From a paper:
Cobalamin-dependent methionine synthase (MS) is a key enzyme in methionine and folate one-carbon metabolism. MS is a large multi-domain protein capable of binding and activating three substrates: homocysteine, folate, and S-adenosylmethionine for methylation. Achieving three chemically distinct methylations necessitates significant domain rearrangements to facilitate substrate access to the cobalamin cofactor at the right time. Here, we use a thermophilic MS homolog (tMS) as a functional MS model.
To interrogate the structural basis of cofactor loading, we sought to crystallize the Cap:Cob:Act tridomain in its apo-form, then performed soaking experiments to obtain the holo-Cap:Cob:Act complex. We selected cyanocobalamin (CN-Cbl), a stable and synthetic Cbl that does not support catalysis. To that end, apo-Cap:Cob:Act tMS crystals were soaked with CN-Cbl, yielding a structure of the holo-complex, solved to 2.95 Å resolution and one in the apo-form obtained prior to soaking, solved to 2.4 Å resolution. The apo-Cap:Cob:Act structure aligns well with the respective portion of the apo-tMS full-length structure, with an RMSD of 2.34 Å. The Act domain is positioned over the Cob domain, indicating that the apo-tridomain structure is found in a conformation that has previously been associated with the enzyme entering the reactivation conformation (Act-on, Cap-off). However, the loop containing His761, relevant to reactivation and cofactor loading, displays some marked differences. Structural alignment with the apo-Cap:Cob:Act structure shows that His761 imidazole side chain of the apo-tridomain is ~6 Å from the docked Cbl cofactor/Co, in an orientation facing away from the cofactor. The captured apo structures (tMS full-length and Cap:Cob:Act tridomain) and the tridomain holo-structure highlight the preformed cobalamin pocket, which is solvent-exposed and thus readily accessible even in crystallo. In order for tMS to undergo reactivation, His761 and the helix α1 adjacent loop on which it is found would have to reorient itself to bind cobalamin in the His-on, base-off mode, and Tyr1132 would need to swing and “uncap” the upper axial portion of the cobalamin cofactor. Furthermore, the captured apo-Cap:Cob:Act structure would fulfill the reorganization requirements, priming the cobalamin cofactor for reductive methylation.
Residue numbers in the entry:
A (entry chain A): 663 to 742, 746 to 880, 895 to 1185
B (entry chain B): 663 to 742, 746 to 880, 899 to 1185
C (entry chain C): 663 to 740, 746 to 879, 893 to 1185
Amino acid sequence: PLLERLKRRVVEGRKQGLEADLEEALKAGHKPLDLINGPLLAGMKEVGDLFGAGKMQLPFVLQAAEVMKRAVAYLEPHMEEGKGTLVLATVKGDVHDIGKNLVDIILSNNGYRVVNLGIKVPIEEILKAVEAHKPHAVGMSGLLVKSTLVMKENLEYMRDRGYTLPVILGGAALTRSYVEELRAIYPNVYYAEDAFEGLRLMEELTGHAPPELTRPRARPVGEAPAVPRPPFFGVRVEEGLDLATIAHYVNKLALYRGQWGYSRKGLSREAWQALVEREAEPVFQRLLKEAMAEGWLEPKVLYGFFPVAREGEELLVFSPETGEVLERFRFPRQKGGGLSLVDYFRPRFAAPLGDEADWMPKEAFRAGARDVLGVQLVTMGEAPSRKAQALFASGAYQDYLFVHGFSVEMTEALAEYWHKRMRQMWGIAHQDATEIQKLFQQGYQGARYSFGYPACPDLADQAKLDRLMGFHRVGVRLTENFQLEPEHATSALVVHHPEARYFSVD
Amino acid sequence: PLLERLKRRVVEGRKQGLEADLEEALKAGHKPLDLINGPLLAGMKEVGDLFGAGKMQLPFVLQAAEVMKRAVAYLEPHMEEGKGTLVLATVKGDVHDIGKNLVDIILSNNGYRVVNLGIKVPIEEILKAVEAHKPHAVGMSGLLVKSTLVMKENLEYMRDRGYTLPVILGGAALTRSYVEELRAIYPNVYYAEDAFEGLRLMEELTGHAPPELTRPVGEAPAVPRPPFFGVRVEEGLDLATIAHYVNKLALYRGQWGYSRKGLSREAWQALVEREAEPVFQRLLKEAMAEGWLEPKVLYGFFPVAREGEELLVFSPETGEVLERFRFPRQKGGGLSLVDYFRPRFAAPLGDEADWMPKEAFRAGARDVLGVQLVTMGEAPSRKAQALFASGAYQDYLFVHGFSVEMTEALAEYWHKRMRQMWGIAHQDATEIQKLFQQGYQGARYSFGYPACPDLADQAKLDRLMGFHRVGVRLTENFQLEPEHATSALVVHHPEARYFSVD
Amino acid sequence: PLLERLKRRVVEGRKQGLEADLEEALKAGHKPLDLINGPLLAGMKEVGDLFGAGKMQLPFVLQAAEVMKRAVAYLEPHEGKGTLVLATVKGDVHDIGKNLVDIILSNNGYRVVNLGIKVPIEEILKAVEAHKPHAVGMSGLLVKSTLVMKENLEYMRDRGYTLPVILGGAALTRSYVEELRAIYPNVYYAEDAFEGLRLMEELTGHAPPELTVAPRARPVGEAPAVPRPPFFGVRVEEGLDLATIAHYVNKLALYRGQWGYSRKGLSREAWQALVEREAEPVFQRLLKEAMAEGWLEPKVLYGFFPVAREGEELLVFSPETGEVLERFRFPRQKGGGLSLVDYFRPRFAAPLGDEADWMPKEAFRAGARDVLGVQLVTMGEAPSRKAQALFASGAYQDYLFVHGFSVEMTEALAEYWHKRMRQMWGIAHQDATEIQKLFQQGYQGARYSFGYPACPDLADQAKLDRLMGFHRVGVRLTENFQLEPEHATSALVVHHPEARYFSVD
């Protein structure tokens, strides 16, 4: 009756009057340990089952996790180990902790001890924690292909040093079949698609569940009608940036679905329209207002234009002062010799289309530059990472998810806004829509390409952009895996060519 | 009884019901002259004695001076001169009148006639006022060393033309011993440290007392890339943002003259919260609404290089050497400002050949120097002069000091902005109390500081930047007009710091 | 003899008959190169050794250099020891020291690239990259030129040069160049051309490394009057008599100082012989030739201004408006002795006699109580043009003679015009009857030229240029404030009867 109420309080996620009910339980015969192991955990189990069915959204799971967190905190003085220990780390060179920290929340509030070592953790630091704590498994996380090769190298090191403990790998670029191939290196390695697979693996490994998981041709790219003149050549900084203006360019469906994990599949269209207006849209307004007042988004842009030319399959970047070739980008071509990014750039020493010899930088034009490439790096600073880490540490799990996702999509909004500003500076903006819904058709002249996209997939090519721009100027650095630190930061090549578009290689 | 009340009204500084008491005094046998010379002056004397003891703050002295000002103004119709006449001037090329105008307030409200000629007054204009008014003394004021050499030249001129009347000198750079040496030129010359020494001298000279009183840098890890090369303007800055960067202890103690000497730490904490902090909030709010602070910035970055003991500034268009700064060295060949700059034609640290302006790099530029000039416009000078003219002496001191420290706050704020633009801000403090002194990469050196004391070097900065673009000019003594204005060199080098030559 | 005769012909310095002897040497076995490297150079080396001893005068060294010059010129129709880039520094007009280094090094076998006068460091180093020399040679007279040499070394070290730099100059000492090795390690001092030869021989690899109660002046009282000038302002005088100017030459300054005839290595009988035989005939020849051909062009810019002392400054007032145009600050002797300002009446001081009657009205009302004479004299660009023609054609002895003559005739013109200023001013009446007595300073007042101890700052010539307009007699100031052309000098002319020459130290 009371125990059913405490079990309901987890599932529905009802904070207010929890401490009154727990106080009544202990004086009516029940022990603090039996409340945690009995009704509070039983609710947390059914939260995970409802997520497996597709009946419960991810923000309500973290609201359920918060009730368990508060329930244990109030029961800590009165009590007078857990199911098992997990060492958990994002791999060397990798800055992304959202996937990992969701694994920390679900496993901790399902009873397991979780040692979270943080981001950019070398294998030596990981295995020092293995010997200190003596866990039932290690958990390794990483976003992109370079991080997956660090995971491989960590397994090579682990097999060589003589470890045989279970290793759980999670990652976007990582697939199930690739982890099966890594069992050539390290036999006791397992793939986890999400946190709840990580929970199943740990239950199977520790001995609380039976072993099942642990068992045509493209149209020709012509000449552009002109090469447009930029306002300047070089790279410049913009800092005075209005967050209310930036907020207008957010992909709200990418925020609400992609980052926060509200869903239309397990609900009706009436309940979707309700869920956005009731829950999601008020959080957006709250975070925007709070971010303006407190100042935990710090919008900055490093932007510029360089004289360029195609030579062969390479794009050459020339110095606007000296005309010396600073960098060479080689982009991949589609199979059967289709489209490449270099097809949008004019050949070196080619006959000018109009009056580009009047305004192209003198030495770069004499060295053969016949085109211009826009470059932008945008960031919201280290401040949103600092704010999210404070919310995580204090145990506000729902607000951690909300602030992380908001910070991701506000950085993308700043990239969208600045791309529009680059087009206006360019003189290619006059075919844009004034309103933002039409920009999600890609309704403008040219395109924006981030490194890691299909048409320019090598994240190493960010290093060339850093040498050209100087990422330090807006507080941004590259890791050993060429990811941007802090994570709320994204760079792009900006292409004027009217035929330019997104395309894949396969 | 009534005369004790009028004497109390000066000392405590009680305005309301003064006019009623003075009306009662004249119909009870007392003449208007004897009220001024008797009880009203007796209060003003004891105000000065309490200041000598360290028992009374400077704002309350000016509140006491206001009571005398109103008392004389109401007694002007009932009369149809004074203890003596003073001609008073800030010297040619000099813009600073706070020291002078405090001498005007104390001497005027101690009975003396004061002819205030204003700022930038040549000796010919001073001596025309001497012949018109026939004073007991001349008063000459000036801030820095170039102004003291104008004072010397004025004394040479005066001795040669055959004047022998007393000359009172005041100034920051002026010392007691230097004025004693100027008696080789002009025997009747006297030093005044403050207004009350000026009062003692005038009392002695006019015949109430006997005549004389007197008295190892390594390489930087990189050269950072600036946002641009050249100069830009920023206008319409947020005064509420600027207000956060004020040195409040420099305002409250340094400019306004509240003190912890003579009081307890309980009464200090009271005095700040009760009196000082409400004046700050009142002046800030009023300055925003009325618009008597006009925050403007002229700022820029230039390609530079060290050759010997000179810093060369190169054109970002042509690469021609525009200006050469020679900075002083510490005694026994210690630190100089040039030690923070890379040598001309020196081997690049990283990629500076790629982005440094082409001709300046070919002419040998290997480094970048930030420059800023900040101002609050002529508007605060105009506002202070209106408060002075109408007789609100306490509000004159408050608005002057506020205007000085808000200009310095704007310099502090913009230095932070220069660091953010330059890419060197990521070691800055989250709080503003840490920003005073170091707490950031590099340093800001204003002309007239110990590390670069020659005010002539501002002329080179004016030719580079164009000070006229934000309403600022240089005088014959190279001071910035209007006075609520300061320029600095901004140095990126992480080992940069404040130092003296001596 | 064979080849001892050609070696003798350089040393004793007999030009005419050389081509016959050189023709006889070839076809008796000897090659043209071996004659130059063997006996002709051997004589040129012993000429320099005799000059080091003090046994041979400098005119005979250049006569010996001429024999080598003609010997090589005749052997030109049918490389050397090393290359030298040679320049007088930016702002400096004096090339006699440099051009003597050019004569001795060229006739000792070395290639000399003479860049000329007022050469910036960028122009010097363009010649370094073109010719690829074994050393650079930098020349300059006065202290401002030595600071340009310092700045050139700073620039050179910074741009990454390490090739030997030889400095020569009057203001330069040996210890100062040792201190410049803090800036540029491979820098060397050369006292004369023969030290420059030794350095170059060592650098090029033809010699081993060795080089590589104070008495107090009387108080200045008031003058008996301020004399009235002919006018206030500035005027030009041209077409002066060179025969008249010739009378005022310091012959001992010409013969010893400029031409380099000497005693000490000779007796007093041989001195009296050497003046009468060699020196005095050259003076008469150059004077007569200068009159006929016209390669001295004597010109004067001269004037008088209302002045007054204020403090340690002399103020110059406008004779039209009475505005203070310029302020001159002169140095004082140690222990507060004499200064040039002590000869000028104080500003606003009580008139001595009738000066209020004739002093310009506004300048007197602004406080002018005294008058300052100013003169700038020149012999034109013509003597520089004449000397350069003698140098180019290879008449090295006549180059030295015409240079020295031109220097001392300009000083003579300054002496003559000072006398004329005294006559115009009304202070000439008690002048010296003879010119020997004029060297004892037997006249009223004194003449102070810029660079002398009483007014040493050459910057103060700029004030005089703004007043007078130096362009009126073809004269300009350089960035080092030297007068271009070099045969030109300015002076302040002081009426005061107690005025005299004094040093500061």
